[PDB]
PDB file of N, CA and C in Angstrom:
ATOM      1  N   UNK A  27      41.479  72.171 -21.002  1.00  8.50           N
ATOM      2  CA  UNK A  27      41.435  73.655 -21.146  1.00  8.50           C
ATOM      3  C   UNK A  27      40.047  74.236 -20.936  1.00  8.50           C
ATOM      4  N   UNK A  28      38.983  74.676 -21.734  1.00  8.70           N
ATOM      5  CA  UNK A  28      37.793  74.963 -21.647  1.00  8.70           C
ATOM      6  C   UNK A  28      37.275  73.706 -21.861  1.00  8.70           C
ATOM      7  N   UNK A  29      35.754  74.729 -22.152  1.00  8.75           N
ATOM      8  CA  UNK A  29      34.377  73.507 -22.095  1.00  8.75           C
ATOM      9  C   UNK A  29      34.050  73.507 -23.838  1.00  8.75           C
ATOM     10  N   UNK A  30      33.142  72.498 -24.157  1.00  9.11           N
ATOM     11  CA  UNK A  30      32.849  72.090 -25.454  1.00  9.11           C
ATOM     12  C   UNK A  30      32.385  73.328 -26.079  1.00  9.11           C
ATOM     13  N   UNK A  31      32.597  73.117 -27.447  1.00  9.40           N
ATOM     14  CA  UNK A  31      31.926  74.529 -28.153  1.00  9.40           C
ATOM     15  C   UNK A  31      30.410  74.031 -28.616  1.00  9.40           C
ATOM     16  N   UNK A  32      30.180  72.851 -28.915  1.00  6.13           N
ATOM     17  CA  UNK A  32      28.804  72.843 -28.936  1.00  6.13           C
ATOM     18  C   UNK A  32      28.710  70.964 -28.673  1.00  6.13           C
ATOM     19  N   UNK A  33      27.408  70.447 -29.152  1.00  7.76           N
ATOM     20  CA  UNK A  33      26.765  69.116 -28.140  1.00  7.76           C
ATOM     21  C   UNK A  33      26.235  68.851 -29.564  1.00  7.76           C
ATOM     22  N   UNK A  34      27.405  67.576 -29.795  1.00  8.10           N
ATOM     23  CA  UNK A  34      26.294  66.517 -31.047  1.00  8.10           C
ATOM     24  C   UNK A  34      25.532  65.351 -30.468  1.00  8.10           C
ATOM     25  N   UNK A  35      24.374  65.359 -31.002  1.00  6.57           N
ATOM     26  CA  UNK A  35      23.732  63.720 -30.684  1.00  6.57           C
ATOM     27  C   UNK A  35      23.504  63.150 -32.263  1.00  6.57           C
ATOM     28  N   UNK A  36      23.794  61.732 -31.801  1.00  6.18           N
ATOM     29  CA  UNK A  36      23.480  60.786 -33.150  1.00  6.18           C
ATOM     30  C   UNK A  36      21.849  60.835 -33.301  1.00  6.18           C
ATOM     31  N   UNK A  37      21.663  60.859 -34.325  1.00  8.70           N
ATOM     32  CA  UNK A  37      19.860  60.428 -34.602  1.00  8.70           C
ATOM     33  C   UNK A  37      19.760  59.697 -35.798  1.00  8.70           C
ATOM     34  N   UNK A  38      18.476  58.784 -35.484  1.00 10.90           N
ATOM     35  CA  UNK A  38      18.600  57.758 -36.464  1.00 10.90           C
ATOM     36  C   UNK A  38      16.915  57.624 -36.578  1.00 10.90           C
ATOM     37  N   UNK A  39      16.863  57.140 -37.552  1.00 11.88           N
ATOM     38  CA  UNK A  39      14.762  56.563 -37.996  1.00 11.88           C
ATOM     39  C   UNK A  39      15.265  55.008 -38.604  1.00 11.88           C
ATOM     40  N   UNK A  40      14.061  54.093 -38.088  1.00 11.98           N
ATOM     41  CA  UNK A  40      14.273  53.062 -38.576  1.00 11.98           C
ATOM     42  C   UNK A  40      13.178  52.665 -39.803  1.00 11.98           C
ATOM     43  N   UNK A  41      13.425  51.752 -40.380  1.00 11.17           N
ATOM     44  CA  UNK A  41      12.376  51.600 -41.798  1.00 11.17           C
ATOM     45  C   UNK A  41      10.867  51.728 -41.071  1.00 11.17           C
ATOM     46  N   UNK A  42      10.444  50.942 -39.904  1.00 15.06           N
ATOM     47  CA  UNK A  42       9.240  51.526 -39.242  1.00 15.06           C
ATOM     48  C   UNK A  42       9.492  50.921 -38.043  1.00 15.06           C
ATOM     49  N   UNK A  43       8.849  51.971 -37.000  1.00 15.37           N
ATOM     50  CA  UNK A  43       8.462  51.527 -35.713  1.00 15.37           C
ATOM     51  C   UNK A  43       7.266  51.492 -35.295  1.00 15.37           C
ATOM     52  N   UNK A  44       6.912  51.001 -33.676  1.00 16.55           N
ATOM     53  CA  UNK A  44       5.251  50.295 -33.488  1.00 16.55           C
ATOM     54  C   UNK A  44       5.135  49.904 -32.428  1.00 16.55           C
ATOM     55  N   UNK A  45       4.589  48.931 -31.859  1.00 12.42           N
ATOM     56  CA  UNK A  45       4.304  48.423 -30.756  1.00 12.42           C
ATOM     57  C   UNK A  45       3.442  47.123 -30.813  1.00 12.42           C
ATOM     58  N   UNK A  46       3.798  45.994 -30.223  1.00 10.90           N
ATOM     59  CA  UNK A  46       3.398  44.959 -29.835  1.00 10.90           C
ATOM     60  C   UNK A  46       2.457  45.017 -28.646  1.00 10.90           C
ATOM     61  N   UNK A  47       1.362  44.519 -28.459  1.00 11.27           N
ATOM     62  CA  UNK A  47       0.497  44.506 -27.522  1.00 11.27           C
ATOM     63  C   UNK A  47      -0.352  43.553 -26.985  1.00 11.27           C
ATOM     64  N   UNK A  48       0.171  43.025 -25.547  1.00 12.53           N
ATOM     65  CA  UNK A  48      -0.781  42.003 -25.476  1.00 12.53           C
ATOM     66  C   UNK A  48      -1.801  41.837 -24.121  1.00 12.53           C
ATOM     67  N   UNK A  49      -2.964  41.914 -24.383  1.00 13.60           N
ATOM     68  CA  UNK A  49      -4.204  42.205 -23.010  1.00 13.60           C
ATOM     69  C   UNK A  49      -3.576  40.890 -22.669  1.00 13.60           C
ATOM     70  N   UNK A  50      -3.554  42.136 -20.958  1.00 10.19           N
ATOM     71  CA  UNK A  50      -3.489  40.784 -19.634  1.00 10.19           C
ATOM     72  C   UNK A  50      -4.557  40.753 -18.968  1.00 10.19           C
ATOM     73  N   UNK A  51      -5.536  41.492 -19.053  1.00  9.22           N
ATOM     74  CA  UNK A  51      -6.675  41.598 -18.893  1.00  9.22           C
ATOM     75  C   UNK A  51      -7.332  42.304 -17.531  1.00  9.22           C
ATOM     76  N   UNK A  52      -8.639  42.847 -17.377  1.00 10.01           N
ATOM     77  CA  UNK A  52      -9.022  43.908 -16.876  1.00 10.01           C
ATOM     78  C   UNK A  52      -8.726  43.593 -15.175  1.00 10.01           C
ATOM     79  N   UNK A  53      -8.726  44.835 -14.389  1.00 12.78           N
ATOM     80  CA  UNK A  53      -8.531  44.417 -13.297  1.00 12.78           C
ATOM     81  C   UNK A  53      -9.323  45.193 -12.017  1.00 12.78           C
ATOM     82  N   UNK A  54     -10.544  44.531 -11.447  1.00 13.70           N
ATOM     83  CA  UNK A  54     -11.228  44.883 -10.742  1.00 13.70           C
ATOM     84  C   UNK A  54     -11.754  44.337  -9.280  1.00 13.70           C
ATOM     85  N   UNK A  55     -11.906  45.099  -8.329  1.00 13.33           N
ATOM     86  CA  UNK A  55     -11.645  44.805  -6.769  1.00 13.33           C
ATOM     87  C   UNK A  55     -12.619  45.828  -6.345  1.00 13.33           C
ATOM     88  N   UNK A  56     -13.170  45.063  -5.274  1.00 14.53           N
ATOM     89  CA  UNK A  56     -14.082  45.795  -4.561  1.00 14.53           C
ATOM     90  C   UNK A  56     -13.254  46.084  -3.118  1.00 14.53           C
ATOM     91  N   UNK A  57     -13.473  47.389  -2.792  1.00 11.81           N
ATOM     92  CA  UNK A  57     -13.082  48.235  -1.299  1.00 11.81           C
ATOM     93  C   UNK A  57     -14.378  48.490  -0.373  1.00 11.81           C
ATOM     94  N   UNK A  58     -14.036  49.213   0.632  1.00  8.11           N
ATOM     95  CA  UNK A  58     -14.156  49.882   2.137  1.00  8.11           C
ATOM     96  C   UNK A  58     -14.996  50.812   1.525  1.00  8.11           C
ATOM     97  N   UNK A  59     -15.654  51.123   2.048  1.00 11.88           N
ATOM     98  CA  UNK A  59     -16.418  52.357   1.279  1.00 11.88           C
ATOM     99  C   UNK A  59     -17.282  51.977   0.425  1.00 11.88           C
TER     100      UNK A  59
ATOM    101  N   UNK B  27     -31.255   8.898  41.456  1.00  9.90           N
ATOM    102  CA  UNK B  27     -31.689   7.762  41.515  1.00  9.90           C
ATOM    103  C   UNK B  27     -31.504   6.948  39.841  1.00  9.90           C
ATOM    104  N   UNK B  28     -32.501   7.281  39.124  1.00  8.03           N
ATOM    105  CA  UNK B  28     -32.549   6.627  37.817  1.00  8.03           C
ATOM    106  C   UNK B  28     -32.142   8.116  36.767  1.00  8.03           C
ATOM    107  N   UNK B  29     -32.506   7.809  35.504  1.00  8.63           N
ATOM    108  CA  UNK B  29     -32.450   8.892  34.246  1.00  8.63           C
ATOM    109  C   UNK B  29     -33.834   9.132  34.023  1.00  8.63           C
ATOM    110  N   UNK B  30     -34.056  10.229  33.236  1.00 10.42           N
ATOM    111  CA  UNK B  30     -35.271  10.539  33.128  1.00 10.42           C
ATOM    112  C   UNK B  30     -36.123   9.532  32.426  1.00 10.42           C
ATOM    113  N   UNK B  31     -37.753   9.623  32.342  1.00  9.07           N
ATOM    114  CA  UNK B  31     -38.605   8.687  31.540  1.00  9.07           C
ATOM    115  C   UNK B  31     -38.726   9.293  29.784  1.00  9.07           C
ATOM    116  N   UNK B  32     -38.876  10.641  29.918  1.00  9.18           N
ATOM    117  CA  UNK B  32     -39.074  11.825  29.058  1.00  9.18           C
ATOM    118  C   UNK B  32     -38.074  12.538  28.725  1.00  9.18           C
ATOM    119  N   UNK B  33     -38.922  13.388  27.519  1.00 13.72           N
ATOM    120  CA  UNK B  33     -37.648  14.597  27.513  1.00 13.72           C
ATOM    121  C   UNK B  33     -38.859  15.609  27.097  1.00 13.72           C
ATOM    122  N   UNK B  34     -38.868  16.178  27.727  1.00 15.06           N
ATOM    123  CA  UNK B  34     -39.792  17.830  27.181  1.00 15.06           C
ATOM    124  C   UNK B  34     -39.575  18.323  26.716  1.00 15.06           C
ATOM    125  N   UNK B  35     -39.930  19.479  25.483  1.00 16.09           N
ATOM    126  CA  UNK B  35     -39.329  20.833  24.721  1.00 16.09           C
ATOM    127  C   UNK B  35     -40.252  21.576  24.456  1.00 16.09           C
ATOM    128  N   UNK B  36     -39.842  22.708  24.823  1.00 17.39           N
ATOM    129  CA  UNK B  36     -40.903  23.872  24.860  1.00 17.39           C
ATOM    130  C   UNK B  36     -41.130  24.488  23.672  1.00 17.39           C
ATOM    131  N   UNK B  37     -42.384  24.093  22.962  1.00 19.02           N
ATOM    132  CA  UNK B  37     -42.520  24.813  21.550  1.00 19.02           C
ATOM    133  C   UNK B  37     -43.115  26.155  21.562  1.00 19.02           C
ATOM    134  N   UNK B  38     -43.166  27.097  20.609  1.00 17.18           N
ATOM    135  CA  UNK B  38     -44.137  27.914  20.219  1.00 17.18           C
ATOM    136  C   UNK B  38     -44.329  28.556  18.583  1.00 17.18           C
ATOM    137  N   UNK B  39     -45.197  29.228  18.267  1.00 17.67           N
ATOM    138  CA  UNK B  39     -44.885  29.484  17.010  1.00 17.67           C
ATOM    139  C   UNK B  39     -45.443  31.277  16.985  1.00 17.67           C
ATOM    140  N   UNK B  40     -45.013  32.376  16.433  1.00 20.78           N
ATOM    141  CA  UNK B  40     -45.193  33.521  16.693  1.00 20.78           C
ATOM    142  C   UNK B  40     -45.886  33.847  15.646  1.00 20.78           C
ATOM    143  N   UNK B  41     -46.971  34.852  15.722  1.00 25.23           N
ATOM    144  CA  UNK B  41     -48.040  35.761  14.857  1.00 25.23           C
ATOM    145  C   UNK B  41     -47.459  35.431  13.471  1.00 25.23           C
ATOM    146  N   UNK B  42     -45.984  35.532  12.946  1.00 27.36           N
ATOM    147  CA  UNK B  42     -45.595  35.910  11.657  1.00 27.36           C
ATOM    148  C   UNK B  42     -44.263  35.579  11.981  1.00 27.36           C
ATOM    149  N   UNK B  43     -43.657  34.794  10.995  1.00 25.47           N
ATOM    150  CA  UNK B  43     -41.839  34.753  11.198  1.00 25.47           C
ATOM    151  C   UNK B  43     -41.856  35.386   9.884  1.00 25.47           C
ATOM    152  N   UNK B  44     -40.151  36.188   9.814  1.00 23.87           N
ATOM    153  CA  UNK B  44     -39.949  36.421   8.449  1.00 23.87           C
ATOM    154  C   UNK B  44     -38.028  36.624   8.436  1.00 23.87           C
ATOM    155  N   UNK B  45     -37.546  37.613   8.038  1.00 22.23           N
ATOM    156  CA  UNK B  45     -36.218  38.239   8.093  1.00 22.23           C
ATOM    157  C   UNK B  45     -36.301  39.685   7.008  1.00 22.23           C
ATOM    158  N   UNK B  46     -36.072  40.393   7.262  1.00 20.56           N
ATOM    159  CA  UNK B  46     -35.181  41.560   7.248  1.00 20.56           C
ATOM    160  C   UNK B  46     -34.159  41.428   6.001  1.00 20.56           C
ATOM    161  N   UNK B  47     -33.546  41.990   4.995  1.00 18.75           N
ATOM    162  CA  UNK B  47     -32.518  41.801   4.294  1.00 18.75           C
ATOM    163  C   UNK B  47     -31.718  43.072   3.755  1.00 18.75           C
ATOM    164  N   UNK B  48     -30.993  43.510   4.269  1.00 15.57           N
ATOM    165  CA  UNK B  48     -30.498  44.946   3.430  1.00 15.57           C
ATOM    166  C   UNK B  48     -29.168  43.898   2.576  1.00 15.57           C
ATOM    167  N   UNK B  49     -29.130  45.005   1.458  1.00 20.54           N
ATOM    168  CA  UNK B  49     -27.757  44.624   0.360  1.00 20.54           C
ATOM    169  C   UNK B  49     -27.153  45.530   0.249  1.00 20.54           C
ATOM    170  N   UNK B  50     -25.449  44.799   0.806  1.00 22.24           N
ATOM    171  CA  UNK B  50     -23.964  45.710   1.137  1.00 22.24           C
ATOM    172  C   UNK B  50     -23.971  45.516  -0.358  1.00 22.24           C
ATOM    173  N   UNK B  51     -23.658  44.858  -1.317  1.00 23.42           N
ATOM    174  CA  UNK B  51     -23.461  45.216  -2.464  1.00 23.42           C
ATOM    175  C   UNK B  51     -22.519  43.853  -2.768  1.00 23.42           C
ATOM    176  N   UNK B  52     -22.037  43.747  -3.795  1.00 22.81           N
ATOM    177  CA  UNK B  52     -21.521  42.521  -4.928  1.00 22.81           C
ATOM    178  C   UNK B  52     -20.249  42.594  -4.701  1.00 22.81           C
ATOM    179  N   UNK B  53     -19.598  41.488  -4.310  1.00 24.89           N
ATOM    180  CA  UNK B  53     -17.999  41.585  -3.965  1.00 24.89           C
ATOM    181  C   UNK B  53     -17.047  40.967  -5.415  1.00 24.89           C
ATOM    182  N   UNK B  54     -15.846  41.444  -5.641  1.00 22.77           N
ATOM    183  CA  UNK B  54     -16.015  40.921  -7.270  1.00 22.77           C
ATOM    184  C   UNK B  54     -14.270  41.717  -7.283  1.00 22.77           C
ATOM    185  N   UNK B  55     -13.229  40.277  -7.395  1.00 21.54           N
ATOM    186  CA  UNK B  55     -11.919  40.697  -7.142  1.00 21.54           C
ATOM    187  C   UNK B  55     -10.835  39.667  -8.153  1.00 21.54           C
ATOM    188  N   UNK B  56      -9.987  40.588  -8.343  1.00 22.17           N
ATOM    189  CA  UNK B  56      -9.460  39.727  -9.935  1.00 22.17           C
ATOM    190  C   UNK B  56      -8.253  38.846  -9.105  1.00 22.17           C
ATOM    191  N   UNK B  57      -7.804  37.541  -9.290  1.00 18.90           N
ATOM    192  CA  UNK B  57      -6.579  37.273  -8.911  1.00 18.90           C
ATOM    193  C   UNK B  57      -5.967  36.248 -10.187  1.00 18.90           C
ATOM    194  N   UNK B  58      -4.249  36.114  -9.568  1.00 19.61           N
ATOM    195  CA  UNK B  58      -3.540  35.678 -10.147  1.00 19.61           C
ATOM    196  C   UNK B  58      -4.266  34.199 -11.017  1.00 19.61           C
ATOM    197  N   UNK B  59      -3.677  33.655 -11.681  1.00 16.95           N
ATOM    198  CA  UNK B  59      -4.074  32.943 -12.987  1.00 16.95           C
ATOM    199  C   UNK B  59      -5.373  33.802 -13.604  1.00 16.95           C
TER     200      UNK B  59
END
């Protein structure tokens, strides 16, 4: 028939979030010029 | 007839030897491992 009357999204938080990080290390090159 | 007795070579030595040097600069490039 019609279109939606309105737009749910689920949302959620977790006990904590973050990031893992691991150096692959620097990266340098000489050019032209 | 035969091979030579000798061998000659023409030496000399000039006022001053030296060289010249300009610097393109440091080449320096990261690779795999």
């Amino acid at each position: 028939g019609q279109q939606p009357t309105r737009q749910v999204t689920p949302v959620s938080a977790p006990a904590a979030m973050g990031t893992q990080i691991t150096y692959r290390g620097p990266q340098v090159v000489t050019q032209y010029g």
